[PDB]
Amino acid sequence: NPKDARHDGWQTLKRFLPYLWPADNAVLRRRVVGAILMVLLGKATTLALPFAYKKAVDAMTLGGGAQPALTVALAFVLAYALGRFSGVLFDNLRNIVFERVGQDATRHLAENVFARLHKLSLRFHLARRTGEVTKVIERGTKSIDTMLYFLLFNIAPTVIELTAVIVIFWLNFGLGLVTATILAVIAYVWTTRTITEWRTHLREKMNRLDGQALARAVDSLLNYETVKYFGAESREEARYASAARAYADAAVKSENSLGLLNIAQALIVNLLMAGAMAWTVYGWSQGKLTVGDLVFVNTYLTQLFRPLDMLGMVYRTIRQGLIDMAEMFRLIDTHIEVADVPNAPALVVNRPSVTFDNVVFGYDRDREILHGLSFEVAAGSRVAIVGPSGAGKSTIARLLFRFYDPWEGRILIDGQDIAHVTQTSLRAALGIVPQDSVLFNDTIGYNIAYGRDGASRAEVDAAAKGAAIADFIARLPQGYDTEVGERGLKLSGGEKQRVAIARTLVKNPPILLFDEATSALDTRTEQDILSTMRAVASHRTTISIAHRLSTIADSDTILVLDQGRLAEQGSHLDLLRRDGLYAEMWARQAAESAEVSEAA
Amino acid sequence: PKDARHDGWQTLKRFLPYLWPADNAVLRRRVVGAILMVLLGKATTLALPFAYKKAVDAMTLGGGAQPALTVALAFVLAYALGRFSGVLFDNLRNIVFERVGQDATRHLAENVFARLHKLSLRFHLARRTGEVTKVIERGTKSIDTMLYFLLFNIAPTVIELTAVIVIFWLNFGLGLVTATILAVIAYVWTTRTITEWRTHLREKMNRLDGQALARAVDSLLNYETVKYFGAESREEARYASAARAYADAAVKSENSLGLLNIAQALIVNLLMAGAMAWTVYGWSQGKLTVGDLVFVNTYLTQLFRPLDMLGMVYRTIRQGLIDMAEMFRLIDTHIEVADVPNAPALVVNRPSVTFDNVVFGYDRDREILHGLSFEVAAGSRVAIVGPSGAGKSTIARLLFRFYDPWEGRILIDGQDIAHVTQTSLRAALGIVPQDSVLFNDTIGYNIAYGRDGASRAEVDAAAKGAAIADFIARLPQGYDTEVGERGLKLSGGEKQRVAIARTLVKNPPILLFDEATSALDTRTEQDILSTMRAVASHRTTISIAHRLSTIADSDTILVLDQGRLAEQGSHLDLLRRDGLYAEMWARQAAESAEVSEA
């Protein structure tokens, strides 16, 4: 198992490798081979070109058997120039050939994470700020892309080139040259790395201060009226100014440290240059080496250290990239609390009854909410579930849609344990109008059609009509194509709840749940929407969970929860007659509304 | 000055005083030092290939192995040291200049910030925090990168190009000179046209990226709804199509970079082939040494090294100049509401308020006040009410002079508020607006905001007067509790009490309640009405309200209709008159009856 290993960069890359070599595609695998071939051609080329330059100088200084020297030297100079152009061509062709592969690999990584995020439990409460998440994901995407590019196109070729230079220097010089350049590369890498750790710290402090200065400015600008009301302009300016100075100080330190890195790098490189060239000319002095060899060695060294001129940034980005990617893999690895059992049959609803069979449940194991809740909802009846503050009624919907499983006991629909069926069929059987309905950032029509995957215009129109929002939509300038939600037209609470009703009408489920559906609405809106809700509950099993008892008094039967168990059951009149918990709640709520009514 | 072609040149010319302050002489010293490093660095990089040329010449005018070794050694060492010194000079120039660059862009930012505070309210300052922040982040990055590339990439390259032209002129060709000049012209032109194309592709890619990301985020933030409709596969397919559109665009954009690099390499290497072939030919005729080949090759590669980035540099310098011109456009934008020259301070000895024939609208095609006149006596509790078209929602904004009347005038005490300093005018006014805002700071900072040097004792007294002191006392950090986001979230009543406390710290003679209770629930509203009445104690108070029962105890009620004063009097006189106020009263009472009925 690759997962059974040390949690480092090597493991992360090893996990990423199958994305780069799909074994699903074969058009992409070809592209990868082609890209590798371009790396090889490009290296062969850049290694070959300095020999051409060397021969040209040799022809000019040892015209003994390289005649006519003019023709020979010209030929080699053209070979050198053509070589430079060719090296660039091969490099860009490898990038171009590979790009599709990279984009596909990262797209598939992202898709796997996205799917897993939808599979994971509700208790991670993914409802947070849009801008924060977006900024983070933008940052991570850029990060992983840069990492991938630098590993494949900067680090790998440099390793190939470095080994080649070692062999070629070995076969033709020194070997003191080989040890000098290897020591040089080691010094260079170590220096760059240690300086880069320091620079990355300074960069983090800089960025933090920048965010603070910007936040002060933005808070001020979005609060222009308040700033005016209190004549606080100068105060705000001074307050931005101090933060902006703290940022400028940190920025100066951060940028300066780059100068220190460049100077260190140049010191190492140029010491090696001085030594190698001195050694080469000395070798010439003894008749061992040609003058062309000087040009050859100098060229080999500058070509070698060219990609390493970015090593600081390369190091910072590959590191951050590996961290960001390991985070992706940690999500994909996180285990799924609620899964279909192996080979789960579809739930088959012929008679839509609902049974809670001795249900024990809580969100967290240190706080049990339901203590053995049992009840039976008849097929086609309209039932309500009510209780006081600790009753646990707010769990019913979440259990029924299997956002969570019972700790003990079970829930059945049509005599079938919902824990043993596919989640998709289970949810196909259920409609819900929740307390707070949320709209996608899309058109109102898209939002209504969302109730069913292939929903036609007629179905949407019919539901909008059934939810009595059709007229409201007709009066919108852009009608069904009116963008709603954030970044869009603002709907009232009643209008959103009507869009939700319309969604469930599109879905047409056999069992429908009103989950505190009217609790966020004002009194008149609540009363208006109740006739609509009653009409849509027509030939379905309906379960309404409500705080205000009068809104559910017309139910076929009412289930009263107390302390996570079923305390009372029956019609509204039977419950008033029993003079128990429901009667007390009813009396209290009526008194409350009477008192509120007194304050006119 | 501003009277110019409005191009990159004008923007840069405007920016120059920021780099050469004439306020700061240390920064000027720094600029001079940076320039000296530019010149030393160039002298160095121009000199080093001559050293390399000599080393080769010494090994080739070697009849034998006579003092060529010492000379060649000396010259290669000069070459390596020259390289290191060039890098040292470049990095020291950056290091010397950095403080100057940072101070210049800071002062530009501060000037923009100050002017934005001077500009009109109607610039619709209400947006997303994340959007403006993203825009400002992008823009600062843009201006910094532009500044760095202009000073350190383009300018030294111009210096070097002129130097290389002269040197090639004096020592070669002159065909060499025309060849390199032609190369550079073709190079710049090619890079520019390809870059315009690439920038279009980049913009499309960015848009598609934003769309795929927005789909993923809207999905995750709607996790419950997706579960409710069992819509996971659907959302996956929807993210996937967008992500493919993005990938196709990313492939095109990145590939076009390869096309740019190849075009550039073609130009550079044609020039290389020609220059070196011609130099070798000059050698064959005894005109040029073999060192000259190495010399020319080095000069050309050094010259074209900074131009290796020219596409990015061009894209960036261009965007930066645009963003900076935007900055200058705001600084230039004219101020709608200004103090008259030598405007006196407002002196409130008796805090009366007069609207004298006020004609006003936010836009000249929609008049709201049509000649509004009324007098508010000093120290009275007055309410302003009206139906849908009355214009009462303009009063607060006019009184604080966020706008001027089109016709007529507003007086406080006996003085036209248009002829006094704005600061003194606002110093006389308190407001509790409908939607109260908290800064992202402590509760104490938020209350203390009412007056510039407000002490903790003052903050305490105001918190007490607003009846929020106990709530603060039960907080662990009390007044040092952070509020706003990400901070403790306050109820509506708690927020309005903070606003009230803020105004108490200011302690103004005239106090405005501008729909102060309209966002509050009934119970909260009734609670806050006693605090508000108490806080109105020795001030001139003006309450603009929708719900009449909340203001019925006022000394007098001004009823506006169609932007004029229709009715005036106490709640009882107004019910007796059986006019517009009586009708509004009856209607509102009937509504509360209907709501109560359900």
Ligand SMILES: N[C@@H](CCC(=O)N[C@@H](CSSC[C@H](NC(=O)CC[C@H](N)C(=O)O)C(=O)NCC(=O)O)C(=O)NCC(=O)O)C(=O)O
């Ligand atoms: N030809 C294209 C530009 C090609 C290009 O973008 N090349 C680079 C960007 S260089 S941008 C990076 C560069 N180097 C560094 O920042 C190195 C700093 C330190 N030495 C370290 O090791 O990190 C820099 O910013 N220098 C500042 C300056 O010279 O003024 C790249 O993306 N990949 C390199 C490759 O694969 O070939 C064009 O004309 O626009």
Ligand SMILES: N[C@@H](CCC(=O)N[C@@H](CSSC[C@H](NC(=O)CC[C@H](N)C(=O)O)C(=O)NCC(=O)O)C(=O)NCC(=O)O)C(=O)O
């Ligand atoms: N911009 C490319 C896209 C391809 C690319 O890879 N470009 C380079 C440009 S680096 S350009 C580097 C330059 N840096 C600086 O000016 C000083 C910062 C110093 N390099 C450091 O490392 O600290 C800068 O503008 N910012 C540095 C930073 O924010 O990290 C890159 O490697 N990444 C950016 C990208 O993908 O577009 C294009 O033109 O197509």
Ligand SMILES: CCCCCCCCCCCC[N+](C)(C)[O-]
């Ligand atoms: C594609 C690989 C290119 C290999 C280039 C080989 C360079 C040979 C170096 C010449 C050796 C110098 N000398 C005169 C001492 O023999």
Ligand SMILES: CCCCCCCCCCCC[N+](C)(C)[O-]
């Ligand atoms: C906070 C970590 C969770 C991030 C997981 C999000 C995965 C889908 C988003 C990928 C976006 C791809 N992009 C930016 C190129 O469009």
Ligand SMILES: CCCCCCCCCCCC[N+](C)(C)[O-]
């Ligand atoms: C999978 C391709 C793109 C996905 C975007 C990357 C995710 C953002 C990084 C997650 C958190 C980063 N980190 C480690 C700083 O927390």
Ligand SMILES: CCCCCCCCCCCC[N+](C)(C)[O-]
């Ligand atoms: C309409 C947008 C106008 C934006 C101008 C606002 C300038 C405020 C200063 C922001 C500077 C932030 N910084 C430089 C520290 O990153």
Ligand SMILES: CCCCCCCCCCCC[N+](C)(C)[O-]
């Ligand atoms: C330290 C840098 C301070 C400079 C602040 C400049 C912010 C630039 C915002 C420009 C955005 C203009 N626009 C509309 C084109 O986006």
